[PDB]
Protein backbone atom coordinates (compact mmCIF):
# COMPACT_ATOMS: atom_id res chain seq x y z
CA UNK A 1 0.00 0.00 0.00
CA UNK A 2 3.17 1.92 0.55
CA UNK A 3 4.12 4.18 -2.46
CA UNK A 4 7.54 4.38 -3.82
CA UNK A 5 9.06 5.97 -7.22
CA UNK A 6 12.43 3.87 -8.58
CA UNK A 7 14.50 5.70 -11.66
CA UNK A 8 15.99 2.58 -13.78
CA UNK A 9 19.22 3.62 -15.07
CA UNK A 10 22.13 2.03 -16.82
CA UNK A 11 24.12 2.19 -19.59
CA UNK A 12 23.04 1.03 -23.37
CA UNK A 13 22.85 -2.19 -23.76
CA UNK A 14 22.87 -3.38 -20.40
CA UNK A 15 19.58 -4.72 -20.60
CA UNK A 16 17.91 -1.99 -18.69
CA UNK A 17 15.07 -2.22 -21.01
CA UNK A 18 14.57 -6.14 -21.02
CA UNK A 19 14.48 -5.71 -17.35
CA UNK A 20 11.95 -2.80 -17.03
CA UNK A 21 9.67 -4.84 -19.27
CA UNK A 22 10.29 -7.85 -16.49
CA UNK A 23 9.69 -5.76 -13.92
CA UNK A 24 6.36 -3.75 -15.41
CA UNK A 25 5.06 -6.39 -17.60
CA UNK A 26 2.22 -5.02 -19.26
CA UNK A 27 1.58 -2.38 -16.62
CA UNK A 28 3.15 0.52 -18.74
CA UNK A 29 2.67 3.89 -19.93
CA UNK A 30 4.78 5.43 -23.32
CA UNK A 31 5.35 8.98 -23.80
CA UNK A 32 8.04 11.65 -24.22
CA UNK A 33 10.36 13.28 -22.01
CA UNK A 34 9.65 17.00 -21.26
CA UNK A 35 9.93 19.04 -24.49
CA UNK A 36 11.61 16.47 -26.47
CA UNK A 37 10.15 13.80 -28.37
CA UNK A 38 12.77 11.64 -26.33
CA UNK A 39 10.34 8.52 -25.20
CA UNK A 40 9.96 8.44 -21.75
CA UNK A 41 7.77 4.88 -20.38
CA UNK A 42 7.57 4.32 -17.17
CA UNK A 43 5.04 1.49 -15.32
CA UNK A 44 3.84 0.29 -11.81
CA UNK A 45 4.75 -3.16 -9.98
CA UNK A 46 4.03 -4.57 -6.42
CA UNK A 47 6.49 -5.75 -4.13
CA UNK A 48 5.15 -6.78 -0.29
CA UNK A 49 5.32 -3.84 1.53
CA UNK A 50 5.57 -1.41 -1.96
CA UNK A 51 3.34 -0.01 -4.74
CA UNK A 52 5.99 0.43 -7.34
CA UNK A 53 6.58 3.80 -10.28
CA UNK A 54 9.37 2.43 -12.41
CA UNK A 55 10.64 5.03 -14.62
CA UNK A 56 13.20 4.43 -17.33
CA UNK A 57 15.36 7.06 -17.89
CA UNK A 58 17.51 7.01 -20.96
CA UNK A 59 20.66 5.42 -21.14
CA UNK A 60 24.29 6.62 -20.36
CA UNK A 61 27.40 6.38 -20.20
CA UNK A 62 27.79 8.92 -17.49
CA UNK A 63 26.26 12.02 -16.32
CA UNK A 64 28.92 14.44 -17.44
CA UNK A 65 30.37 15.68 -20.29
CA UNK A 66 34.06 17.40 -20.13
CA UNK A 67 34.68 17.61 -23.98
CA UNK A 68 32.44 17.88 -26.81
CA UNK A 69 28.81 18.76 -26.30
CA UNK A 70 25.09 17.57 -26.71
CA UNK A 71 22.98 14.88 -25.33
CA UNK A 72 19.69 14.83 -24.56
CA UNK A 73 20.06 11.35 -23.03
CA UNK A 74 22.51 12.79 -20.62
CA UNK A 75 20.89 15.96 -19.89
CA UNK A 76 17.67 14.50 -19.14
CA UNK A 77 18.95 11.65 -16.85
CA UNK A 78 21.24 14.18 -14.59
CA UNK A 79 18.25 16.54 -14.30
CA UNK A 80 16.28 13.96 -13.09
CA UNK A 81 18.15 12.26 -10.81
CA UNK A 82 19.32 15.58 -9.43
CA UNK A 83 15.38 16.56 -9.36
CA UNK A 84 15.15 14.25 -5.95
CA UNK A 85 11.75 12.90 -7.59
CA UNK A 86 12.80 9.02 -7.11
CA UNK A 87 13.19 7.64 -4.07
CA UNK A 88 15.53 5.69 -5.22
CA UNK A 89 17.74 3.98 -8.24
CA UNK A 90 18.50 0.69 -9.85
CA UNK A 91 21.75 1.12 -11.34
CA UNK A 92 21.58 -2.00 -13.97
CA UNK A 93 25.17 -3.27 -14.72
CA UNK A 94 26.86 -4.93 -17.61
CA UNK A 95 28.99 -7.68 -15.56
CA UNK A 96 30.76 -8.65 -18.95
CA UNK A 97 32.09 -4.71 -18.80
CA UNK A 98 32.00 -4.05 -15.22
CA UNK A 99 34.90 -1.59 -15.40
CA UNK A 100 33.30 0.38 -18.25
CA UNK A 101 29.70 0.70 -16.05
CA UNK A 102 31.48 1.56 -12.55
CA UNK A 103 32.05 5.03 -13.68
CA UNK A 104 28.40 6.06 -13.98
CA UNK A 105 27.76 3.32 -10.62
CA UNK A 106 30.47 5.76 -9.32
CA UNK A 107 28.66 9.16 -9.84
CA UNK A 108 25.49 8.13 -8.63
CA UNK A 109 26.93 6.93 -5.25
CA UNK A 110 28.96 10.32 -5.01
CA UNK A 111 25.65 12.04 -5.53
CA UNK A 112 24.91 9.76 -2.81
CA UNK A 113 21.40 8.61 -3.94
CA UNK A 114 19.94 5.66 -2.39
CA UNK A 115 21.11 2.67 -5.15
CA UNK A 116 20.40 -1.00 -5.84
CA UNK A 117 23.13 -2.12 -8.44
CA UNK A 118 21.49 -5.06 -10.52
CA UNK A 119 24.29 -7.08 -11.95
CA UNK A 120 22.82 -8.45 -15.45
CA UNK A 121 24.95 -10.26 -18.39
CA UNK A 122 25.45 -13.09 -15.76
CA UNK A 123 25.44 -15.90 -18.17
CA UNK A 124 27.78 -13.84 -21.01
CA UNK A 125 30.29 -13.22 -18.25
CA UNK A 126 30.43 -16.68 -16.77
CA UNK A 127 30.51 -17.95 -20.46
CA UNK A 128 34.33 -15.40 -21.57
CA UNK A 129 35.07 -16.76 -17.98
CA UNK A 130 34.43 -13.62 -15.65
CA UNK A 131 33.79 -14.33 -12.53
CA UNK A 132 32.44 -11.11 -10.73
CA UNK A 133 32.68 -11.13 -6.33
CA UNK A 134 29.33 -9.64 -5.00
CA UNK A 135 29.74 -8.92 -1.91
CA UNK A 136 33.38 -7.50 -2.31
CA UNK A 137 31.59 -5.26 -4.91
CA UNK A 138 29.17 -4.00 -2.40
CA UNK A 139 31.17 -3.94 0.37
CA UNK A 140 33.22 -0.99 -1.64
CA UNK A 141 30.24 0.32 -3.15
CA UNK A 142 28.47 0.70 -0.01
CA UNK A 143 25.07 -0.05 -1.40
CA UNK A 144 23.02 -3.90 -2.89
CA UNK A 145 24.98 -5.50 -5.44
CA UNK A 146 21.88 -8.19 -6.88
CA UNK A 147 23.22 -10.58 -9.26
CA UNK A 148 19.78 -10.63 -11.77
CA UNK A 149 19.74 -14.81 -12.10
CA UNK A 150 18.01 -15.28 -15.17
CA UNK A 151 16.03 -18.96 -14.31
CA UNK A 152 13.28 -18.73 -13.04
CA UNK A 153 14.19 -15.31 -12.19
CA UNK A 154 14.06 -15.38 -8.98
CA UNK A 155 16.43 -12.59 -9.71
CA UNK A 156 13.90 -10.27 -9.80
CA UNK A 157 12.10 -11.69 -6.74
CA UNK A 158 16.07 -10.86 -4.91
CA UNK A 159 15.59 -7.15 -6.51
CA UNK A 160 12.28 -6.72 -4.95
CA UNK A 161 13.54 -7.91 -1.24
CA UNK A 162 15.77 -5.71 -1.77
CA UNK A 163 13.90 -2.84 -3.12
CA UNK A 164 11.27 -3.67 0.28
CA UNK A 165 14.47 -3.47 2.48
CA UNK A 166 16.32 0.06 0.97
CA UNK A 167 17.84 2.34 2.84
CA UNK A 168 20.28 5.22 2.82
CA UNK A 169 24.18 3.82 1.58
CA UNK A 170 27.29 3.00 3.56
CA UNK A 171 29.38 6.18 3.65
CA UNK A 172 32.37 4.14 2.19
CA UNK A 173 35.25 5.74 0.95
CA UNK A 174 35.24 6.15 -2.95
CA UNK A 175 37.30 8.42 -4.78
CA UNK A 176 40.41 9.57 -3.50
CA UNK A 177 40.46 13.08 -5.08
CA UNK A 178 43.29 15.36 -4.04
CA UNK A 179 42.50 17.61 -1.13
CA UNK A 180 42.83 20.77 -2.97
CA UNK A 181 40.18 20.12 -5.36
CA UNK A 182 38.05 19.19 -2.32
CA UNK A 183 38.71 22.29 -0.41
CA UNK A 184 37.92 24.48 -3.90
CA UNK A 185 34.79 22.35 -4.81
CA UNK A 186 33.55 22.69 -1.27
CA UNK A 187 34.17 26.33 -1.51
CA UNK A 188 32.08 26.64 -4.45
CA UNK A 189 29.21 24.24 -2.97
CA UNK A 190 28.85 26.79 -0.52
CA UNK A 191 27.81 29.43 -2.97
CA UNK A 192 25.53 27.02 -4.78
CA UNK A 193 21.60 27.23 -4.54
CA UNK A 194 20.75 26.24 -0.56
CA UNK A 195 17.37 23.97 -1.57
CA UNK A 196 20.88 21.27 -3.05
CA UNK A 197 21.63 18.67 -0.80
CA UNK A 198 25.45 19.66 0.49
CA UNK A 199 26.99 16.60 -1.32
CA UNK A 200 25.36 16.88 -4.04
CA UNK A 201 26.95 20.97 -4.30
CA UNK A 202 30.05 19.41 -3.77
CA UNK A 203 30.15 16.87 -6.49
CA UNK A 204 28.68 19.46 -8.44
CA UNK A 205 31.59 21.68 -7.95
CA UNK A 206 34.10 18.96 -8.38
CA UNK A 207 32.71 18.45 -11.74
CA UNK A 208 32.79 22.21 -12.93
CA UNK A 209 36.46 21.96 -11.99
CA UNK A 210 37.02 19.04 -13.97
CA UNK A 211 34.82 21.36 -16.71
CA UNK A 212 31.32 19.62 -16.75
CA UNK A 213 28.88 22.19 -18.38
CA UNK A 214 25.88 20.42 -17.87
CA UNK A 215 26.14 21.13 -14.17
CA UNK A 216 26.76 25.01 -13.97
CA UNK A 217 23.10 25.31 -14.43
CA UNK A 218 22.81 23.75 -11.11
CA UNK A 219 25.27 25.88 -9.35
CA UNK A 220 23.86 29.10 -9.47
CA UNK A 221 26.46 31.98 -8.42
CA UNK A 222 29.55 29.17 -8.46
CA UNK A 223 29.70 29.81 -11.70
CA UNK A 224 31.20 32.87 -10.63
CA UNK A 225 34.01 31.79 -8.61
CA UNK A 226 35.17 28.84 -11.01
CA UNK A 227 37.94 30.61 -12.66
CA UNK A 228 39.46 32.06 -9.53
CA UNK A 229 39.08 28.65 -7.87
CA UNK A 230 40.95 26.96 -11.05
CA UNK A 231 43.49 29.48 -11.23
CA UNK A 232 44.58 28.52 -7.65
CA UNK A 233 44.62 25.05 -8.72
CA UNK A 234 46.52 25.63 -11.42
CA UNK A 235 48.77 26.83 -9.25
CA UNK A 236 48.54 23.59 -7.15
CA UNK A 237 49.10 21.16 -9.72
CA UNK A 238 49.28 20.27 -13.49
CA UNK A 239 45.78 19.81 -15.09
CA UNK A 240 42.95 19.52 -11.99
CA UNK A 241 40.46 17.80 -14.18
CA UNK A 242 43.24 15.21 -15.13
CA UNK A 243 44.00 14.29 -11.38
CA UNK A 244 40.09 14.34 -11.62
CA UNK A 245 40.47 11.80 -14.04
CA UNK A 246 43.35 10.04 -12.49
CA UNK A 247 42.06 9.19 -9.31
CA UNK A 248 38.68 7.72 -10.72
CA UNK A 249 40.36 5.31 -12.80
CA UNK A 250 42.38 4.39 -9.88
CA UNK A 251 39.64 3.76 -7.76
CA UNK A 252 37.81 1.90 -10.50
CA UNK A 253 41.17 -0.15 -11.34
CA UNK A 254 41.08 -1.04 -8.21
CA UNK A 255 37.89 -2.29 -6.85
CA UNK A 256 37.91 -3.87 -10.78
CA UNK A 257 41.19 -5.63 -9.80
CA UNK A 258 39.36 -7.14 -6.30
CA UNK A 259 36.16 -7.83 -7.89
CA UNK A 260 36.53 -9.40 -11.26
CA UNK A 261 38.57 -12.85 -11.49
CA UNK A 262 38.96 -15.51 -13.82
CA UNK A 263 36.70 -18.38 -13.24
CA UNK A 264 39.53 -20.65 -14.68
Not at 148 to 177: F, P
Request: glycine content about 6%; hydrophobic content about 40%; aromatic content about 4%.
Amino acid sequence: MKKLTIGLIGNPNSGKTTLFNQLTGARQRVGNWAGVTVERKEGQFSTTDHQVTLVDLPGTYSLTTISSQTSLDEQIACHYILSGDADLLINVVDASNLERNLYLTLQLLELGIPCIVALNMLDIAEKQNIRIEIDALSARLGCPVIPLVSTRGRGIEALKLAIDRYKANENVELVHYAQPLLNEADSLAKVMPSDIPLKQRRWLGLQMLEGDIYSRAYAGEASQHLDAALARLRNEMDDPALHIADARYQCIAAICDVVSNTLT
